[PDB]
Amino acid sequence: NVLQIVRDHWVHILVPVGFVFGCYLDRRSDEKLTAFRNKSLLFKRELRPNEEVTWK
Amino acid sequence: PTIRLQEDPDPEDENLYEKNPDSHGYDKDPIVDLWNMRVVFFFGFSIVLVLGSTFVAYLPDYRMQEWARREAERLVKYREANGLPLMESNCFDPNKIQLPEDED
Amino acid sequence: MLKIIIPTTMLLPMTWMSKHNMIWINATVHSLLISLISLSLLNQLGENSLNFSLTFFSDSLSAPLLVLTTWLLPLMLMASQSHLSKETTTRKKLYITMLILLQLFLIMTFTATELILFYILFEATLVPTLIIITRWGNQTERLNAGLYFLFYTLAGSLPLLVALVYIQNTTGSLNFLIIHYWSHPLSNSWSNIFMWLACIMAFMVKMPLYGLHLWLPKAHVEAPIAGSMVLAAVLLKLGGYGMMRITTILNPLTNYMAYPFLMLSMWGMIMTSSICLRQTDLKSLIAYSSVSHMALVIVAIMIQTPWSFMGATALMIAHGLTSSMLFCLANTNYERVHSRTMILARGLQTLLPLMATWWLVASLTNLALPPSINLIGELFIITASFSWSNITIILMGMNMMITALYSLYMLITTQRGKYTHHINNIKPSFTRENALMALHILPLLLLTLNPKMILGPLY
Amino acid sequence: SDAPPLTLEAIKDRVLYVLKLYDKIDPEKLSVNSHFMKDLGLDSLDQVEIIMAMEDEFGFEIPDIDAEKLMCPQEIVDYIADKKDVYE
Amino acid sequence: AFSAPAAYLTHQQKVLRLYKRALRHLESWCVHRDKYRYFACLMRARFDEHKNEKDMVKATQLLRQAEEEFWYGQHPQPYIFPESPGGTSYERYECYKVPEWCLDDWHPSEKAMYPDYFAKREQWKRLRRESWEREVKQLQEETPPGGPRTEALPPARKEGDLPPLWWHIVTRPRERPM
Amino acid sequence: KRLFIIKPSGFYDRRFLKLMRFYILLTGIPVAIGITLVNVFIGEAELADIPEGYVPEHWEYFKHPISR
């Protein structure tokens, strides 16, 4: 019976999916501005024995 | 015809209470009306208002107000203990400022 | 910050793919969710802004405006579904599309890092507003209003564009951060004077400044209720935001270029407050109230002090909420009696008590009762003006009296006295209208509880 | 509580009481339907004085346009009853 | 307030009104009852001295001097009955007067209480509805062809008629509604 | 004696007030109870010095558990 329910209320996932897509695109934008990661004079720091990057 | 054009008459306004004594003012269909009221009240008052106010009230201190107060306490303690003035009229050391040679 | 922009562009096809009787519910629910999402931008720093990308950034001045816009969209949706019941499905979807496009343009305008992009979006906001006004307005004046709304804007904004590109051919960048860091003083020459005028006149006509305000009564009176809401609460704040942004490159010319505009702002604040005392139209009274408050905001921006900027930000937020509430309150009576004359429907407190309580709270907030944020902004601006010059306390004080008068005047005209005998079609207030009033008024006092969220970057 | 619910009989009694204290009317000759100019032989000034006495007795003012028309005690009682929403 | 006004006031009407105003203001001046009775008798004699003037011009001239004297010697703060248009309770209860048509918008739960009252209301509404066509026709018949010349309304004359335009006079809210 | 007092319909204002109170309380009583429970059983962090060689997480720089 879920066919009619889906074809009537499938418009309710467009906005949440857009929210997740926007979060993913914000992360993709963030990954292109790492030219000074762990390089500022105020926050320059030695890496921990395991971690690879100070922030993502 | 003594008239100017063929036109419909202006209709009287419809009262939503006639066909629905408890009508909530949202829609003529009682079920869609009731659910419009329910979603408005739940997502406006319950979700956004109260939870948003709770979220704003407990936002972490990114303005560094408490940190600034603690820093000021440290500096006041140090400068009062060692007798230095509490503040200086110069915010930059004159040794790194090079004034022009001639003023005449 | 695409996590806010994309859900609106998704509101678009969700509205266009909705079933014919479920458009309002879906739109309101998802707009409220988007407002809840945008609430996270209030977590600001103390030193710099939130630089999300090369294109968009958020600051302590733009975050409250974004929250107000995303909160205003659902309120417009609730306020619009009453008078659009007889419309066809396609035209209802078109109306919702105009509202969504306006919200998207405003969201992108308040966060643009670039001045030309800011100009493009701040000019793109005209098309949905103009279409709404000239298509869904009620009387035949609306067409003229649209023209008055259009050219008044464009004649102010087209010179700005020229100035903008000129600046980009001199400094090499119009990015706001670089502009702020690489700021240099403006000399005293005729070319610099005209560059100052070109940079200022667009935002001064969008405020609107006294003498340049003639478009505002037309636009706010012939527009539909959602159009009036968005015109008064958000679209007037574009001028204030733009002036606060652009003034970083105009010093020290402002030091003496503000005199004519300061004089106009103060005297026209007095003049418009006085005009409110003799107004037969209830919507025009609210429009002129907006003019007076925005004159105060102009003074605050023009005197260029931290307290003035704080008060100006608080005043813009408070005025947006209050004026939207007043317009909705007037629209309820209009929908009941189909007339805008203030002395037509009288003694409504007897017939609608809870509506009378809403009217009382709105009027008390309009006259800046302590400790409302309206008062906080007004008092900060007044203290800054007193520091600027002790004599201003005269004019400001005058305004403080006049406002109260006309404010209570409206209340005493509409709620007290005796009811009109021949008007018998005043039905009990719907739950929708009461919810609209409550959702307007509760955030005001909630922000009064935590006032540092709307005090801007100078806090 | 407040004043008792004034009745038609009480109003008529009070009006007749006030009229019977007037020196220019004979108490025996006075009736509820007696006319002021015709049966009692009074002029307009006496009618004005009677209206003022009624105003003093009941504590509310009767407009001149309405007071000009009341010519018998029954009319005065009726005007008072319609003014004060008395039906019993 | 109940009677239809005329195009003008007659000389006798003006004299009577001035007499009443003078008596009331003199009473406002003379607080005590015996003093008021003394000076009211004096005023009555003063009024009836010129009662028999056959010259209308001299009568209206005497009235002119009377009005001038009253305006000079009026009480600045005359006694006003509390519910009179200048009294301390003139419109005190107007905020409690609610029109009857509001009851037409009550929820059925509210109308569940007071069933007999609403039955009587239905009877009254039916009577008004039946009565309206006749009331209009009677007003049409009794009106002179050049429109009405006064604000007076005719009574009912037919077997079971009602006086035209009676609904809002009969259904006044109350003098002390709540 | 008792008479009928003519009033406007008080059903709808009362209904709206009841509904607003119901929804506000529906979402706010759990919030108040949770805040009280967190405050009682998970107190606020105590100020302390950073030990040598330790790099605290950012949320460790705040004192209230909900803020953290």
Ligand SMILES: CCCCCCCCCCCCCCCCCC(=O)OC[C@H](COP(=O)([O-])OCC(O)COP(=O)([O-])OC[C@@H](COC(=O)CCCCCCCCCCCCCCCCC)OC(=O)CCCCCCCCCCCCCCCCC)OC(=O)CCCCCCCCCCCCCCCCC
């Ligand atoms: C129906 C509404 C209709 C519509 C209207 C519009 C409504 C719109 C609403 C919109 C949404 C609003 C959301 C806003 C969110 C705000 C929440 C928040 O930030 O909480 C802050 C704050 C909590 O502070 P915190 O920072 O979280 O705690 C930090 C500490 O770590 C904690 O310290 P601690 O370690 O000591 O622990 C204390 C703990 C536990 O402490 C204790 O238990 C001890 C208490 C003392 C009692 C000791 C003796 C008594 C018992 C003795 C006998 C028994 C013991 C022995 C047994 C034997 C018997 C003898 O208690 C608490 O945590 C405080 C209670 C939490 C309340 C949170 C409020 C949430 C509101 C969100 C929902 C909004 C809707 C309302 C619904 C709410 C419910 C109706 O909440 C308060 O309000 C505190 C106020 C209390 C202070 C006292 C008042 C002083 C008055 C002075 C002024 C006088 C002038 C006159 C003014 C009078 C005015 C009162």
Ligand SMILES: CCCCCCCCCCCCCCCCC[C@@H](O)O[C@H](CO[C@H](O)CCCCCCCCCCCCCCC)COP(=O)(O)OCC[N+](C)(C)C
């Ligand atoms: C119907 C009848 C009503 C009358 C009866 C009501 C019964 C009582 C209810 C009324 C409550 C009285 C208020 C008393 C004050 C207590 C609340 C106060 O203490 O909370 C404040 C908190 O207030 C919040 O910060 C303000 C709420 C945020 C407002 C946002 C509104 C929601 C967004 C909706 C869209 C916005 C549109 C406008 C654009 C900006 C404290 O501020 P703060 O000093 O920090 O707290 C320090 C401790 N912390 C930090 C650990 C928490």
Ligand SMILES: CCCCCCCCCCCCCCCCC[C@@H](O)O[C@H](CO[C@H](O)CCCCCCCCCCCCCCC)COP(=O)(O)OCC[N+](C)(C)C
């Ligand atoms: C309806 C409301 C619309 C909004 C109104 C906007 C207000 C715009 C007004 C512009 C503010 C000032 C403009 C120019 C700045 C100074 C004005 C001038 O009077 O000052 C003297 C200028 O001297 C003389 O006045 C020369 C100017 C005379 C010619 C200007 C025409 C003024 C006529 C007014 C018409 C109304 C204009 C608005 C039309 C709508 C100063 O002497 P000077 O040192 O030498 O000039 C300084 C520049 N230097 C340093 C490069 C030399």
Ligand SMILES: CCCCCCCCCCCC(=O)SCCNC(=O)CCNC(=O)[C@H](O)C(C)(C)COP(=O)(O)O
């Ligand atoms: C307190 C300070 C103010 C004092 C003001 C008072 C002082 C003024 C007193 C003197 C003024 C006069 O007498 S002015 C005298 C005016 N002259 C006439 O009226 C002659 C014609 N007579 C009539 O019109 C009627 O007989 C009529 C008399 C109306 C009787 O009415 P009735 O028989 O059909 O009831």
